[PDB]
Symmetry: C2
């Protein structure tokens, strides 16, 4: 199986990169990800809300109301500067981890 | 704040340990030694953290353990056939996830035109 920890990490990863490309609202994120995957990836709405609560807690995304001029009120999400840094740190740490593994493969090889 | 959350730190540590075992059955002190050298002395994992992670991985069937021969007798750990398959499933799903975002970036770009 893909364990539950990894599925959530994949969904977290998708949501942050979508918001990196532009402010968005939940149904639009789900629609856009389904489109980018030719209908194959249907994100679970319930799962977005728990992740969004966490990301808002950590200051990684913020929200604001739009579409009020028509008589409605939709919540939009934005990647914050803390969020941009978190993505940079995730890239940099994962590159460090990957380099350690590459080094290990080599050290194993050169011993031979 | 912005720092790497505990979930991702655990995922990164899991990644390292399973990739060490992918490259060959091994024992805790030997894993710690190898990671320390592959990280140019900077990452010296504590044996307790390995025991914590291995207890979980063994419970979930991803690794198993067995004794070597002898002035001591080391406990070896191995990636199971489920563990190997999990790595392939992980590679394949993360590759799909990455391409989805790549598509969204491309779509975003070409629309701007
Ligand atoms: Cu990424
Ligand atoms: Cu990997």
């Amino acid at each position: 199986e893909i364990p539950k920890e990894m599925l959530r990490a994949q969904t977290n990863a998708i949501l942050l990169n979508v918001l990196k490309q532009g402010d968005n609202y939940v149904y639009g994120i789900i629609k856009q990800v389904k489109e980018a995957s030719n209908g194959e990836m249907e994100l679970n709405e319930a799962t977005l809300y728990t992740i969004f609560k966490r990301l808002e807690k950590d200051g990684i995304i913020s929200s604001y109301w739009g579409d009020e001029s028509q008589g409605g009120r939709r919540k939009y999400y934005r990647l914050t500067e803390i969020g941009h840094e978190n993505m940079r740190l995730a890239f940099e740490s994962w590159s460090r981890v990957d380099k350690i593994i590459e080094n290990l493969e080599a050290n194993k090889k050169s011993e031979a």
